[PDB]
Amino acid sequence: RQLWFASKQSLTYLDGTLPGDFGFDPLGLSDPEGTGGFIEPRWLAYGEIFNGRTAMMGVVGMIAPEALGKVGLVPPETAIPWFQAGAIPPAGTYQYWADPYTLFVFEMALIGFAEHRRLQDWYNPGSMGKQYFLGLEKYLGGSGDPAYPGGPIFNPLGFGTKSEKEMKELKLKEIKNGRLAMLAFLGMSLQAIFTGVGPFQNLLDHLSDPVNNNILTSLKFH
Amino acid sequence: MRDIKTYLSVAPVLSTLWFGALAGLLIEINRLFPDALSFPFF
Amino acid sequence: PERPIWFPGSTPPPWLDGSLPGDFGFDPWGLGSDPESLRWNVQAELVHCRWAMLGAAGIFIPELLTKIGILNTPSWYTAGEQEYFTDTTTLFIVELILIGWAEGRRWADIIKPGCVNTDPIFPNNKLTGTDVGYPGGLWFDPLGYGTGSPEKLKELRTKEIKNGRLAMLAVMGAWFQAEYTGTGPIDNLFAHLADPGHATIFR
Amino acid sequence: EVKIVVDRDPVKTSFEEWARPGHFSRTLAKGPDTTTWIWNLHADAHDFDSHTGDLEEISRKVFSAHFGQLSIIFLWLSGMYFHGARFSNYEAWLSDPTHIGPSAQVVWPIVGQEILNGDVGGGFRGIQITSGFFQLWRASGITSELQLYCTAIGALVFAALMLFAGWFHYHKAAPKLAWFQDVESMLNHHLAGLLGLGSLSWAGHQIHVSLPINQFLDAGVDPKEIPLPHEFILNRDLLAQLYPSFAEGATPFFTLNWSKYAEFLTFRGGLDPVTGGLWLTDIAHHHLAIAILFLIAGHMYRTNWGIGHGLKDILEAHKGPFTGQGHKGLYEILTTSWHAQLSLNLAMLGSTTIVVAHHMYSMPPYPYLATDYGTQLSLFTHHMWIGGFLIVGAAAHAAIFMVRDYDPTTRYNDLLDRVLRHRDAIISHLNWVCIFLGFHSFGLYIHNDTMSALGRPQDMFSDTAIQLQPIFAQWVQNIHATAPGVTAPGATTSTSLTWGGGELVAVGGKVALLPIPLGTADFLVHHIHAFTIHVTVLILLKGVLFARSSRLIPDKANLGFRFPCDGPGRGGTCQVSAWDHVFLGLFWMYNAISVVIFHFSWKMQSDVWGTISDQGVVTHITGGNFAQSSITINGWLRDFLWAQASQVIQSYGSSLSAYGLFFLGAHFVWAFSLMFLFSGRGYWQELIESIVWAHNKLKVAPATQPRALSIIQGRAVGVTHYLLGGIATTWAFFLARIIAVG
Numbered sequence A: 001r002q003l004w005f006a007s008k009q010s011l012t013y014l015d016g017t018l019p020g021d022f023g024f025d026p027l028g029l030s031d032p033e034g035t036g037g038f039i040e041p042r043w044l045a046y047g048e049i050f051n052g053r054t055a056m057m058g059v060v061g062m063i064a065p066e067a068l069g070k071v072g073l074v075p076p077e078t079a080i081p082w083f084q085a086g087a088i089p090p091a092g093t094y095q096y097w098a099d100p101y102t103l104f105v106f107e108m109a110l111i112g113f114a115e116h117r118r119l120q121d122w123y124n125p126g127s128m129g130k131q132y133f134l135g136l137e138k139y140l141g142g143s144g145d146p147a148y149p150g151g152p153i154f155n156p157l158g159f160g161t162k163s164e165k166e167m168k169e170l171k172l173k174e175i176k177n178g179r180l181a182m183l184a185f186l187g188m189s190l191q192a193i194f195t196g197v198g199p200f201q202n203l204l205d206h207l208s209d210p211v212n213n214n215i216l217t218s219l220k221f222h
Numbered sequence B: 001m002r003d004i005k006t007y008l009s010v011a012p013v014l015s016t017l018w019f020g021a022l023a024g025l026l027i028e029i030n031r032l033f034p035d036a037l038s039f040p041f042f
Numbered sequence C: 001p002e003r004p005i006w007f008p009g010s011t012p013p014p015w016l017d018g019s020l021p022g023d024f025g026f027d028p029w030g031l032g033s034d035p036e037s038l039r040w041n042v043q044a045e046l047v048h049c050r051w052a053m054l055g056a057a058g059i060f061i062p063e064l065l066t067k068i069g070i071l072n073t074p075s076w077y078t079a080g081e082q083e084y085f086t087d088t089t090t091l092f093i094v095e096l097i098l099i100g101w102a103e104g105r106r107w108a109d110i111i112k113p114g115c116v117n118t119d120p121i122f123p124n125n126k127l128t129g130t131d132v133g134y135p136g137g138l139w140f141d142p143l144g145y146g147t148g149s150p151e152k153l154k155e156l157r158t159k160e161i162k163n164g165r166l167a168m169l170a171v172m173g174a175w176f177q178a179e180y181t182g183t184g185p186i187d188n189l190f191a192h193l194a195d196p197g198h199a200t201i202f203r
Numbered sequence D: 001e002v003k004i005v006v007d008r009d010p011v012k013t014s015f016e017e018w019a020r021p022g023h024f025s026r027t028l029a030k031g032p033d034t035t036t037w038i039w040n041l042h043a044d045a046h047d048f049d050s051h052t053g054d055l056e057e058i059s060r061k062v063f064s065a066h067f068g069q070l071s072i073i074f075l076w077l078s079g080m081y082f083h084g085a086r087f088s089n090y091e092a093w094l095s096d097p098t099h100i101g102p103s104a105q106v107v108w109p110i111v112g113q114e115i116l117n118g119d120v121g122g123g124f125r126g127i128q129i130t131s132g133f134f135q136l137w138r139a140s141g142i143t144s145e146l147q148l149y150c151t152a153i154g155a156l157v158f159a160a161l162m163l164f165a166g167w168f169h170y171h172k173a174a175p176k177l178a179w180f181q182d183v184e185s186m187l188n189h190h191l192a193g194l195l196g197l198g199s200l201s202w203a204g205h206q207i208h209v210s211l212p213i214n215q216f217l218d219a220g221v222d223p224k225e226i227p228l229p230h231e232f233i234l235n236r237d238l239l240a241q242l243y244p245s246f247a248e249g250a251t252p253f254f255t256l257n258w259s260k261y262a263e264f265l266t267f268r269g270g271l272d273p274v275t276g277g278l279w280l281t282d283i284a285h286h287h288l289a290i291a292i293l294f295l296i297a298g299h300m301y302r303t304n305w306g307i308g309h310g311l312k313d314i315l316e317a318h319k320g321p322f323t324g325q326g327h328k329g330l331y332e333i334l335t336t337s338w339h340a341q342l343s344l345n346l347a348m349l350g351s352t353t354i355v356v357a358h359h360m361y362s363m364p365p366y367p368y369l370a371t372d373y374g375t376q377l378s379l380f381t382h383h384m385w386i387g388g389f390l391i392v393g394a395a396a397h398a399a400i401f402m403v404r405d406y407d408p409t410t411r412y413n414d415l416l417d418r419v420l421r422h423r424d425a426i427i428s429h430l431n432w433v434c435i436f437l438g439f440h441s442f443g444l445y446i447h448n449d450t451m452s453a454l455g456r457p458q459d460m461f462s463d464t465a466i467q468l469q470p471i472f473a474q475w476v477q478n479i480h481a482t483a484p485g486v487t488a489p490g491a492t493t494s495t496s497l498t499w500g501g502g503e504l505v506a507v508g509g510k511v512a513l514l515p516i517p518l519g520t521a522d523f524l525v526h527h528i529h530a531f532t533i534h535v536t537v538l539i540l541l542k543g544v545l546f547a548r549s550s551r552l553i554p555d556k557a558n559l560g561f562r563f564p565c566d567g568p569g570r571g572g573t574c575q576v577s578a579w580d581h582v583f584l585g586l587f588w589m590y591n592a593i594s595v596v597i598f599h600f601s602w603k604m605q606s607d608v609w610g611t612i613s614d615q616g617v618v619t620h621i622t623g624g625n626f627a628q629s630s631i632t633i634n635g636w637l638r639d640f641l642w643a644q645a646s647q648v649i650q651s652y653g654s655s656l657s658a659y660g661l662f663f664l665g666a667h668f669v670w671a672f673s674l675m676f677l678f679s680g681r682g683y684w685q686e687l688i689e690s691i692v693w694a695h696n697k698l699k700v701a702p703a704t705q706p707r708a709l710s711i712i713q714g715r716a717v718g719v720t721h722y723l724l725g726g727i728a729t730t731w732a733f734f735l736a737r738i739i740a741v742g
């Protein structure tokens, strides 16, 4: 059990049974003595894995389109740095089949079904496989662990087929990857504010010229 | 539902509702028959 | 009990038990928490279900048929301002009387069930309905169609409320659309059909 | 340690208690015995201490209650921003702020009251405001009706946030006691988080928005063409065209070459000749300097890691020979009693409000605030009254602590003990001074008036006769005038313009400020203020010390905080409760403040304000008569009350009519209060009985038996009206007078 910047408070509750544990917690948050809302160690763990997963597909989409624009068969029109895809109009935009704010509400409705149902199973286990939902109820009950619902829709082939250690090994891989992605996305942002030439370019700027080291420069431009 | 109606029936809440209606009525009449110093109908 | 709920997996309020037609356990604020208001409100929702159903028929059907060339009906929005064979005021007054007659008798049945169903003039014209809000009788059931077994009326009445709820949204749809869009309801349909991703609330 | 343990769902959200009035108190809940019941319902509504006996619930209620108070303020702010956007000539005011009155209220024309819509100019009409928002919206570079609208929505949203927050933290997840009592972290966050990061963030908005934009308007441009504030923050070259230090970016800040930002971070001092306000560079620098000081101060008290102080140990080292045990034990009695903290906070926040009013008239911080005579007089008068009341409140709650929470068997303190033991000395000595000042402050006015009446104007106390020169104020004025020379070499000019040297600042034919002389006539009035302040201290201080016992009544504590009397025995014991000492203090607070805001109004019109000639000669509003006519009591009647009430009195038939009515209306309420103060209850109870009999005759006798007001309510209503009549009369007296003459 490797520990990183541990604390006496941390090792009272960070037992290591939770995957991704390294006993790093110096702000009293996951402390189980204080539990109102959103300070439950489960909920925080629930928010930990989900944020990582969103990062794990958020990161890749944050470097895929321009880098695939480096050699790939994507017509350069839809090959753009991530912040000018249309999310931030003052960085730029692109005219998709829609006009924006209809894409948003569409997206917020599609998400609404998955999200809210994803919430109820945390409140009431097995509830989301009870009321009629055009079939599919046989799967949407979940395996009892909200973060790891399982089922043929979520775990189609089935890994963690039968090994808890592997699953514990796997889930350890799932969080450390998750932490890696959260920091990484925080990297793609703060680079953008200072560099302002896009994420993957800013690695070349340090590739062709390691003596660039924009740290010492700290020039700001859009 | 019953408790809401009861609360709405306590004296101060009726007062503002009653007087407010009364204020609206008098203001309307003065908007339609202004200056009104005499009662010249009969 | 296990009937579908508006919010699946939630706990429906106790005073909603699925007996009434259209009871999907929806009452966050508990407006029908006490039985009496529920009884009145059941009527309130019921009649509102019928008026809008005509209003939806009143707005959409003519505007549809005038959008194509078959007729001449103007916009429902400015329908009131139009000048018909006499002044609007008296017709509204005439509307005040006659509706007040039915909205009078209906009122009596609500406050006291079953005391209004016999014709005041030709006493053999008695009405057949037993449930409050379902008058029955030959005037309002020219062939019956309401006098059946349960689990059928519950189906049928739910087929009456569930359509009515569909109307009340739609007419308020035609309401706000006419205000912040400059045209009729059908245009707001078509301009949404040419460029669905562009022509919306966000202009 | 320091953690966040809260509870889950203490009290269930329900409407039942909304239909059981007086549920909170066991006594009130039984029902309306008589009409005395419906007065005790409100008198004990908020007294959370009397409802329950443990600190945990009292805490959760005050914590949630504040959220309500916080929410209302946001709603109040939201209206002010909304009203300024939909019903104001703000955008017109941004063109000629010198000579267009700020108007942000428009009345519906029902009963002729559209005469109130005054010709405030700018192609608009409406009630001319005086709260001075317009100078605040210009100092922040608003320059649009749209931007005033969006903040109004933003202000409104937070009101829903706060109000929601209040609900959540009392019915859903209420904090525990251990959360509240951890007062080290409390201070630690407020110093660094609220106070510290509040300034730094604001010092941000001034650097990027208010400064470069207002530098356009001051340079002189129509408001419609000023590039929007997000253009500077995007197009960094625009900031270059004004401020070349913005080319290098934030790297000098990191290489300690701080003298590169000298263009927009300075130490000028003085006032801006163009706009008559402070230099926004200084203000920009000021919040930045404050930010660092607060933030570092935040990191003092130990919270969870090794570093930091212990507030308990700081109070337990200062103990002295004369004092004995020193500040030991004060940590408890300042932690397990809300009435201690409320009394201590009230005094400081009360005092600070006053210092705010002394600075905002001498170092005018917003542009075009100096030449706004309507605003200066109101803002100075407003915060004096607010400051006056809050100090009186600190006496009441200190008195309440002595009765309820104080206990010398557990929460024992030594200093608060020694102070009690020699209380006879404290009051008697403070009694002698209040007499000494009384004779030598008012008496000099009386002697002046007598000699003047007898035809001996060479025995009066004045600059032209026996002289009383304030030298100590005249000396300190001298020091601040020459401070820019030696003792503050950085400063270009003095910190103000009222120092006894320098030169005036003229803005649009209206004097901003000039050196305020201090002769004999000012010496007397400064010793009037020293008199009424002392007397007000005497009353409140006596109440606090003698709130538990005295040589008359040895068990006064057992009688509570606000009890009427102890009967007519022992000669008569009317008004011995600490509540009646604060009841008496209110008048003197009303007395001290009123002369202060009289002193300010006459001194500024006579010696400072007024138009300015093109040639350069200055003519003040009243012709500079303060130095001769303010030394005689009759002088304060002729040339201040009688001669400066002309505008209010003849304000009928023009937009200032509403002040003419309030002037009278406030007299009526003032004279009305006397019926309650002078008379007593036992007479009004009997007359009520005879009135009650007539209703028995016609069967209309109510079942909540009529009663006269309780003894301490007859006083409470008496003082309240008296204060309302007195303050409002001055209110209508001031605004109508100053608005017409400038």
Ligand code: CLA
Pocket: D431, D434, D435, D436, D437, D438, D439, D442, D443, D446, D535, D538, D539, D584, D587, D588
């Ligand atoms: C105009 C009305 C008035 C006057 C003159 C006074 C005067 C006084 N009040 Mg007072 N008071 C008043 C209204 C007034 N009050 C009202 C309305 C209230 C209710 C709120 C109070 C409440 C109140 C309290 C609660 C207290 C006072 C106190 C005082 C005394 C302190 C001032 C002092 O020592 O000066 C000295 C006296 C004067 C300035 C009066 C004028 C004297 C001149 C200079 C000369 C007089 C003539 C001279 C003696 C020649 C004699 C001639 C010969 C023929 C006899 C003083 C006697 C305080 C006190 O006594 O403790 C110190 C105190 O605690 N009063």
Ligand SMILES: CC(/C=C/C=C(C)/C=C/[C@@]12O[C@]1(C)C[C@@H](O)CC2(C)C)=C\C=C\C=C(C)\C=C\C=C(C)\C=C\[C@@]12O[C@]1(C)C[C@@H](O)CC2(C)C
Pocket: C026, C027, C028, C029, C030, C031, C048, C051, C052, C053, C054, C055, C056, C058, C059, C075, C076, C077, C079, C080, C167, C168, C169, C171, C172
């Ligand atoms: C939408 C509506 C009511 C909606 C009520 C809602 C959402 C309440 C929901 C909730 O309470 C519940 C359920 C449960 C609570 O716990 C939660 C909330 C959320 C609080 C009524 C519309 C009702 C709509 C009606 C009645 C429409 C009537 C139409 C009429 C009368 C005809 C009009 C015409 O004649 C004119 C005017 C002009 C002619 O040219 C044209 C025609 C059309 C012919």
Ligand SMILES: CC1=C[C@H](O)CC(C)(C)[C@H]1/C=C/C(C)=C/C=C/C(C)=C/C=C/C=C(C)/C=C/C=C(C)/C=C/C1=C(C)C[C@H](O)CC1(C)C
Pocket: A024, A025, A026, A027, A028, A029, A051, A052, A054, A055, A057, A058, A059, A060, A061, A062, A082, A083, A084, A085, A086, A087, A182, A183, A185, A186
């Ligand atoms: C633990 C602890 C404890 C102690 O006691 C104290 C402390 C230390 C403080 C703490 C710490 C904490 C932390 C650090 C945290 C972090 C987190 C994160 C970062 C997350 C992220 C997170 C993040 C995330 C999710 C992200 C995501 C993203 C995404 C999706 C993206 C998207 C996109 C794209 C693609 C493109 C387009 O065009 C645009 C967009 C739309 C934009």
Ligand SMILES: CC1=C(C/C=C(\C)CCC[C@H](C)CCC[C@H](C)CCCC(C)C)C(=O)c2ccccc2C1=O
Pocket: D675, D676, D677, D679, D680, D681, D684, D685, D707, D708, D709, D710, D711, D713, D714, D715
């Ligand atoms: C006048 C006076 C009264 C009499 C005042 C009383 C009895 C209260 C004033 C009457 C109020 C206004 C009750 C009226 C309000 C009722 C709720 C009825 C409301 C109906 C209206 C809508 C018309 C006292 O009781 C008293 C007590 C102690 C010292 C001095 C005095 C004192 O001076």
Ligand code: SF4
Pocket: D564, D565, D566, D567, D568, D569, D572, D573, D574, D575, D711
């Ligand atoms: S007069 Fe009133 S206050 Fe004085 S003793 Fe009698 S009852 Fe008490």
